[PDB]
């Protein structure tokens, strides 16, 4: 159409592929998608803590990811690349997806909180927060707030500097919302 619409079209294109791939690549450890868009073959760069899951169990998942990409888009030769995230513990969205699995697993609240806090502070976190809104295994709507170091400030040069990762860790009695807000040194 014009200049204005196309940019928004592209950005809408980012979401439909970033939404699905997160939900699948929770086994890998999803952290991002650097999407390079061309008329030759859409080049998606999937970010994982671990590349050995994304490839698959023998080529299946990388081909599966090549095959659903043809359906959504009109570039029918989309490449796949796996780049590692360089600090997955500096990435919050990784820690949210990583914490979600552990609560899916059944490990206790403050324990499942402590380790997490401790692995990213070791990594280099000026400050960190984990919040867990949910049932908290009764039937009252209370969140538990695990707190160390600095935090998100005021305004918006608040939220740009910090990291923020959200994940619904499913249970079979209810649900628990996993928020992980990291503050990197800066």
């Amino acid at each position: 159409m014009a200049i204005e619409r196309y940019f928004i079209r592209e950005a809408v294109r980012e979401m439909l592929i970033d939404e699905f791939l997160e939900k699948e690549l929770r086994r890998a450890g999803y952290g991002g998608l650097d999407i390079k868009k061309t008329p030759l073959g859409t080049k998606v760069i999937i970010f994982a803590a671990n590349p050995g899951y994304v490839i698959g169990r023998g080529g299946r998942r990388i081909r599966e990811l090549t095959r659903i990409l043809e359906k959504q888009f009109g570039l029918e030769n989309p490449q796949i690349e796996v780049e590692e995230i360089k600090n997955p513990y500096l990435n919050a969205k990784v820690q949210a997806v990583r914490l979600a699995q552990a609560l899916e697993r059944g490990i206790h609240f403050r324990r499942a909180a402590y380790a997490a806090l401790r692995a990213i502070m070791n990594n280099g976190a000026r400050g960190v927060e984990i919040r867990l809104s949910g049932k908290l295994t009764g039937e009252r709507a209370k969140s538990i707030r695990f707190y160390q170091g600095y935090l998100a400030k005021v305004g918006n040069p608040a939220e740009t500097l910090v990291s923020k990762g959200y994940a619904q860790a499913l249970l079979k009695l209810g649900v628990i919302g996993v928020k992980v807000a990291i503050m990197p040194p800066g």
Binding site: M1, R5, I8, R9, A11, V12, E14, M15, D18, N156
Partner: protein, 56 residues
Amino acid sequence: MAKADYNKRKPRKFGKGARRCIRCGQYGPIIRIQGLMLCRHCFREVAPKLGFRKYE
């Protein structure tokens, strides 16, 4: 018995019932038509990845 197919076959030429989103699959709930058909509620969740800015 026997009968021919159905997947809906009535008029839906235009209006709200014509539209659906590409995230929560609705007719009557919001459809922002700029080539970004979603509801108002999705819009808010999606935008920081879009590159829209909160600031007025």
